[PDB]
Amino acid sequence: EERLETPSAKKLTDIGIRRIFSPEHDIFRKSVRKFFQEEVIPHHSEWEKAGEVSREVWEKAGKQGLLGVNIAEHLGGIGGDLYSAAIVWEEQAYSNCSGPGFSIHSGIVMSYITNHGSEEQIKHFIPQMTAGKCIGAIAMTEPGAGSDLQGIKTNAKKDGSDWILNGSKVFISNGSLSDVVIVVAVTNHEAPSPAHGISLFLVENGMKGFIKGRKLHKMGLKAQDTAELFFEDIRLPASALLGEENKGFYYIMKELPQERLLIADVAISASEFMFEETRNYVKQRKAFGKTVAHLQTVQHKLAELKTHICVTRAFVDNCLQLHEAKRLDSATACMAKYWASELQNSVAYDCVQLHGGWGYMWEYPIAKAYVDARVQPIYGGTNEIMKELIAREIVFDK
Amino acid sequence: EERLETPSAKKLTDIGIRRIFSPEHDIFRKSVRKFFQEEVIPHHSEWEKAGEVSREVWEKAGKQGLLGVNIAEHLGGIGGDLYSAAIVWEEQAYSNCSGPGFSIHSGIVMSYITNHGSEEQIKHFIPQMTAGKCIGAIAMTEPGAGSDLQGIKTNAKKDGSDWILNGSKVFISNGSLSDVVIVVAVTNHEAPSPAHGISLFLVENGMKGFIKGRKLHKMGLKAQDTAELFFEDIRLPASALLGEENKGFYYIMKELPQERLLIADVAISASEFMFEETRNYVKQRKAFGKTVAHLQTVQHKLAELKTHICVTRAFVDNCLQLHEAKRLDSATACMAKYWASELQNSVAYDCVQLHGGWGYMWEYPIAKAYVDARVQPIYGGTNEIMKELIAREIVFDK
Amino acid sequence: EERLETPSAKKLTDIGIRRIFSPEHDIFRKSVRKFFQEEVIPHHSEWEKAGEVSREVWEKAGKQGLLGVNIAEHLGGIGGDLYSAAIVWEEQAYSNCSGPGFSIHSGIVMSYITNHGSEEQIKHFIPQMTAGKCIGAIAMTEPGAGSDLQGIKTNAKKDGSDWILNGSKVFISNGSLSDVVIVVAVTNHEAPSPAHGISLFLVENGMKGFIKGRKLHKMGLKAQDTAELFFEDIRLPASALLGEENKGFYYIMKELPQERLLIADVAISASEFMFEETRNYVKQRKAFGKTVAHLQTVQHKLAELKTHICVTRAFVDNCLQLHEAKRLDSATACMAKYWASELQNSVAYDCVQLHGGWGYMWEYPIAKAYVDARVQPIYGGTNEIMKELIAREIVFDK
Amino acid sequence: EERLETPSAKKLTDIGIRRIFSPEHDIFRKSVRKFFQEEVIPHHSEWEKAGEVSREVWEKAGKQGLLGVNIAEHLGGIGGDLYSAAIVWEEQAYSNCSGPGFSIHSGIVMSYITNHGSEEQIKHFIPQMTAGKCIGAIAMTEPGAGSDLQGIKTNAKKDGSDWILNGSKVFISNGSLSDVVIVVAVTNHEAPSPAHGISLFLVENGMKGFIKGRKLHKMGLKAQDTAELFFEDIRLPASALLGEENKGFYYIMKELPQERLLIADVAISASEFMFEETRNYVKQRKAFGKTVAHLQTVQHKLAELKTHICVTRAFVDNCLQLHEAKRLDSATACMAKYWASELQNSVAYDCVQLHGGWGYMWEYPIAKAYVDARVQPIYGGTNEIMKELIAREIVFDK
Ligand SMILES: Cc1cc2nc3c(=O)[nH]c(=O)nc-3n(C[C@H](O)[C@H](O)[C@H](O)COP(=O)(O)OP(=O)(O)OC[C@H]3O[C@@H](n4cnc5c(N)ncnc54)[C@H](O)[C@@H]3O)c2cc1C
Ligand SMILES: Cc1cc2nc3c(=O)[nH]c(=O)nc-3n(C[C@H](O)[C@H](O)[C@H](O)COP(=O)(O)OP(=O)(O)OC[C@H]3O[C@@H](n4cnc5c(N)ncnc54)[C@H](O)[C@@H]3O)c2cc1C
Ligand SMILES: Cc1cc2nc3c(=O)[nH]c(=O)nc-3n(C[C@H](O)[C@H](O)[C@H](O)COP(=O)(O)OP(=O)(O)OC[C@H]3O[C@@H](n4cnc5c(N)ncnc54)[C@H](O)[C@@H]3O)c2cc1C
Ligand SMILES: Cc1cc2nc3c(=O)[nH]c(=O)nc-3n(C[C@H](O)[C@H](O)[C@H](O)COP(=O)(O)OP(=O)(O)OC[C@H]3O[C@@H](n4cnc5c(N)ncnc54)[C@H](O)[C@@H]3O)c2cc1C
Structure with missing residues (x-):
């Protein structure tokens, strides 16, 4: 009836704001x-x-x-x-x-x-x-190939109605808890373009030859069980195949838009959370006979941060509106993933700075937020790649 | 029924796009x-x-x-x-x-x-x-005081039911081709704040005392007749007073948001132009056998600008919609003005750079769009002032 | 005896500072x-x-x-x-x-x-x-290419002892007042790579066929006479040829390091100028009961500008001491050229901002400075070419 | 003899380069x-x-x-x-x-x-x-005050020739291992400003009342034993006092330049390390039938990085030379500590990206570098306080 947009809300995270919500x-x-x-x-x-x-x-x-x-x-x-x-x-x-x-x-x-x-x-x-x-997980990246999908060596060969899978993935989220893992593998080692020789398999915990590797030591997502997976002659029945044979890349291309929207929103949300936390910290941090929020450099630093967060939020909310109507294209989602993920990091850098030395301490939320943010510009396809896709429609018009 | 958003358009300027238009x-x-x-x-x-x-x-x-x-x-x-x-x-x-x-x-x-x-x-x-x-123009800024209101000295004293106006104004748009001008003057030098002693006046070209000054020599808007104004003992009838006496600032307060949204839309729109004008130009610019658009770096700089232009666009239309509903508070207005004008300039800068040397010749549209863009972060309140305002709600709970 | 560096200097433009001078x-x-x-x-x-x-x-x-x-x-x-x-x-x-x-x-x-x-x-x-x-000048760029390195089409075919020149140039400094103008031509188009099919000729005002296009209308550098140059069939004696025939490129190369170190020192020097001009303005521009120079944000903006201008100056000075010793490679000079020239512009954008409306008036020195800085990033080889050149040793091992 | 500067050495970290060395x-x-x-x-x-x-x-x-x-x-x-x-x-x-x-x-x-x-x-x-x-450590910072000195509560009341030290410190490097700690305390509460009521004290491990607090859990510097210390009515002998009573502030000020120059060189050296580490990585990282270093973008990001590192190195070397001559003032020292440290983080961020997802794995050096680098813009005085000091000489005449 009379919903407020983030700029006007009391706090970026308040409930009952933004127009896309009922x-x-x-x-x-x-x-x-x-x-x-x-x-x-x-x-x-x-x-x-x-x-x-x-x-x-x-x-x-x-x-x-x-x-x-x-x-x-x-x-x-x-x-x-x-x-x-x-x-x-x-x-x-x-x-x-x-x-x-x-x-x-x-x-x-x-x-x-x-x-x-x-x-x-x-x-x-x-x-x-x-x-x-x-619990679900999806493994497509490999030691060698992550941005160059056309060059990943995990493969699956037919042996009757069965598919024998061999290979290994890396950086797999939920890799440790995973019960079912959608594995991306090469089925046509001879298709014209490797984009017509990939299939998707629903590999499961319990299949002989499915080895879960050591949990990766990271700088962030400390509680996320990111791990490596290995496949040693796993005999997959016919039903293991997800979708049509060799249509693997195609199913992916259609889902990426959502995988990126998901990231974009998560990042701008993270940004909103960091912003209210820090605004808070500096309003209660005594200094020079008053709080640090009284300092003008701090006041403008907070103004620049809020503006970029509300402006971007507007675009992501604009994207959510589209994806709901199923009119969210590849390029668009890419713009959201990329900008929102880069901003999330720039916001965190400045929010740790406003906490002074306490921002470096793990007991303070912002410290977690900072190292957690550095992964976003990387997965879901790095931002460099995001730009490649965005530039497609720019310089190579249909 | 169904419309595309700037990102997916064939051109950021095509007609028929943007969900907010019929x-x-x-x-x-x-x-x-x-x-x-x-x-x-x-x-x-x-x-x-x-x-x-x-x-x-x-x-x-x-x-x-x-x-x-x-x-x-x-x-x-x-x-x-x-x-x-x-x-x-x-x-x-x-x-x-x-x-x-x-x-x-x-x-x-x-x-x-x-x-x-x-x-x-x-x-x-x-x-x-x-x-x-x-034609119309509005004058407030003075030689000594723009961002400050306790700094303006143009005034008007009562003489029966007439108003004797004195002082000057500077940086006035449509200053030379104007017929009516809304002058901001002090009418109560006793008010605690100048926000309680200012009034608005409708001076008309031809009045004794009203003088059109020098047409300022600027670095851009070489076609805007930006001038200086003088008011030497002008006897203004009671009809010149616009609104109550000493309420002038209160009105200015109500109108600024529209001034800022406009400049914001104008700003981003100006960016939308420079992009296509630069996209097209580097697509046709031959170099190393192909065109400069085949350079990956030129491809990414291009992706970067489009993402920033599209993300801001979304926010500006967000603000048009709110204002259409007459629900656009000052802070949001300020964010629009501040971030859009700023973007405009780092876009105008990169676009020039992609135009190589010719981006420096006045023959090409970009060159002038560059020197034209520089005036946006200054008028309607400098971006610095924008930040002061947007920081008010962040730090001072009323 | 003793000498301070820019940071310590009372003004950055003070005489009697910087180790390299006596x-x-x-x-x-x-x-x-x-x-x-x-x-x-x-x-x-x-x-x-x-x-x-x-x-x-x-x-x-x-x-x-x-x-x-x-x-x-x-x-x-x-x-x-x-x-x-x-x-x-x-x-x-x-x-x-x-x-x-x-x-x-x-x-x-x-x-x-x-x-x-x-x-x-x-x-x-x-x-x-x-x-x-x-008055001397030099021309190498043509409306078709300034970075192609072979985009140059002006040819010079021999006819006995006197060469017949043909082609055209653009963006030539000292264009009109130019008595003599070095020109780069293709003396052996058959060359393996045109870096071997180039030569230098000393064209002189008066020679038949040497026309001079009119004054180019630029965005900045107003009192800099830049015009186009044509060569409609001029017989040149055996003297016009500078250095060896076809070994002309080797020359452009051996002198470029210096053209670029030049622009660098200029850029940072204009930057040292703008800083002091602007610092002066702020310290006397009254605002809110005291000078705008009393605002913390300004004080900080000023510190960022001084630090960069100082960090960089040191580098340019370092590049000077090296060049004085005939040991300043292309790469090092390019860096100084790339960074100095860009900095000059950002410094120009911020300096204008601190002047407010007045920074947009041709009346104030900073205004012309703003547009006169926008050319450094472009000429003497654009900053992108500077990157290509620096990247080589980085990526492609000698 | 013919020593080279970083921009021309095989590796920015090669021994035998930079002119200030023998x-x-x-x-x-x-x-x-x-x-x-x-x-x-x-x-x-x-x-x-x-x-x-x-x-x-x-x-x-x-x-x-x-x-x-x-x-x-x-x-x-x-x-x-x-x-x-x-x-x-x-x-x-x-x-x-x-x-x-x-x-x-x-x-x-x-x-x-x-x-x-x-x-x-x-x-x-x-x-x-x-x-x-x-092993020694320095202890000034306290939980409620790190930038505002007027707010350190640690005090030492004089008793005969003895001093009764009470209070606590936090974020103390070598805190756990510390055999000797230089504690900053308030000796004169009724002094004019707080810069005249501070003395330094040599607190040693073993002194009754000197309890070592727990090791703080950080996001970086994981091998640095950073702890909090407590002083419980410790009776320090007159030999515990370092320097003149109440002149503690004066000693600090005198040493600060060296502390900030040190942090600065450490920063730019870390950047030099990271650059070389990343360049190396991209040259060996195979992608798209070539390496990551074949992509034009990676090349320019590398040129940009190297340029800033070579430039900041130029300025930092100049500071060392100045410091060797004992002519390094506060401002110049802040300038290097502030910029070098911010650059270190900018550099660390782009080096992590270039490493793709592997740059998020603790196994890789660039990951340690990332979190390890975020601490420098904070300690030694925040980069904001750095600007405050730099901005001093700019706005307020000596
Ligand atoms: C914690 C974490 C969780 C993740 N979760 C998953 C997951 O669950 N499943 C999964 O499969 N993967 C996941 N990943 C991996 C991530 O998706 C990949 O790292 C990323 O998509 C590609 O990076 P890479 O590791 O393959 O490195 P590479 O692709 O080898 O290198 C990428 C970098 O090289 C350069 N580059 C690459 N291509 C280009 C280009 N074409 N143009 C210009 N520059 C380019 C840029 O620096 C780019 O950022 C995750 C990663 C991490 C760290
Ligand atoms: C081309 C052009 C057209 C214009 N048209 C009109 C018009 O038609 N009518 C009209 O009246 N005006 C108009 N203006 C004037 C414009 O609105 C004023 O320039 C602006 O409102 C204030 O700038 P100033 O020149 O007064 O700068 P000042 O107010 O003297 O100084 C502003 C600068 O000081 C600093 N600053 C000031 N206050 C703060 C603060 N509170 N916190 C941090 N920094 C601060 C910043 O550097 C800021 O940029 C126009 C200006 C130009 C150039
Ligand atoms: C006022 C003025 C004075 C000048 N004086 C001289 C002079 O005295 N003599 C003279 O000959 N020239 C001079 N010039 C011209 C100047 O040297 C050229 O403009 C400059 O070298 C760029 O070439 P271009 O103008 O042909 O632009 P182009 O080379 O056509 O375009 C340059 C842009 O294309 C892209 N680009 C080009 N190459 C690459 C690449 N290899 N990798 C990645 N991106 C690339 C980038 O956007 C680059 O900025 C001057 C120019 C001006 C405006
Ligand atoms: C791991 C680590 C090691 C350290 N080692 C030492 C050590 O060995 N000994 C020691 O005593 N300390 C050390 N420190 C502490 C460090 O020096 C202090 O944290 C720093 O000097 C001030 O931090 P703070 O949190 O007290 O600042 P706070 O006052 O809590 O906040 C500072 C921030 O508030 C704002 N701010 C503060 N003042 C101003 C201003 N006046 N103008 C504009 N903005 C301002 C800025 O964001 C500034 O960065 C270390 C810290 C860490 C994290």
């Missing part, structure tokens, strides 16, 4: 937020030391209806609009807890399985995934 | 775009030498219905909506012709008169204005 | 400064309206001992060291007067002739240039 | 680089798990002459000029091992003692600190 979305958001305050934030520090979140926190997120929110109810998901899905990405961001990998799981893997899987595959996976009993 | 608005845009291509661009380079546009080009746009577009029809205006008006700003910016002080005429002066004037004042001014016969 | 140089500098305040500044106002400067001031300069300074005395030059010629580039930059093409004339045109020329060409023109009678 | 300096540099490769690098990953290095590495360092390098030989140190002390800083920075607090020990603590101590204090400490058997 009052039902508001009610949902308040509960998702309660959920993070109570079931996630409290245990996060321990998962960090642990290297991954608990299955128990997944099992609950599912019983609560936070997993597979944009997945069709008649397909096994909870069945909400896109806006309801983003509320989950955003609220997780706002809790500044990066351990839970619900997004990779809910917004990516599940979409691949429902948008391109057999009636059987969907029936078998989707339900467990929504309940959080079956 | 099929009708496009017809009007097609026509205004037309007006500028024939009635303006051809003669602009000539007006540049003259230091001002012709009163003829003004009148044409008058009858053409390009003035007072957002001014209510029953008040002497063409009675359109905010968007229709925005179109006008945008098309002129797209023409790369900064001479016509059209925007300040329709968007600021006329709005001041209708929103705050009285019956005679409205029936005596608007028509001549909507007609393009009685 | 009292010897200091006396000559005060000597040169005087020349610019008394013989250049006074008339610049006018030359900007004539597009070109007076032929007289050039004779005054030369007679005075400014033209031909790094030019050895045994060949008709003042013979001073590099620091001496540097002092001339700098002082002019400090004068904010860009009309005089003194630097291209005695820093480039005179080196070429005396570095690869016959004892005839030397005796014949050097002395007349040093005197300020024969 | 053949004996290079001989020393090989010795130290070697020590870091043998005694430090190999054990660092374990010290990282521990949160502090071993005392063994210290006693080693001491024995091999790396501690107290620029301290007077007759005073207990090992004698030697600044350039030699700079090399120990730089080399450590080149080993990318921030664990050992050798610099804060030799570059700061020892200097405070040998510059203002007593013949008794000097004799009792330097010897043991040179042997690395007595």
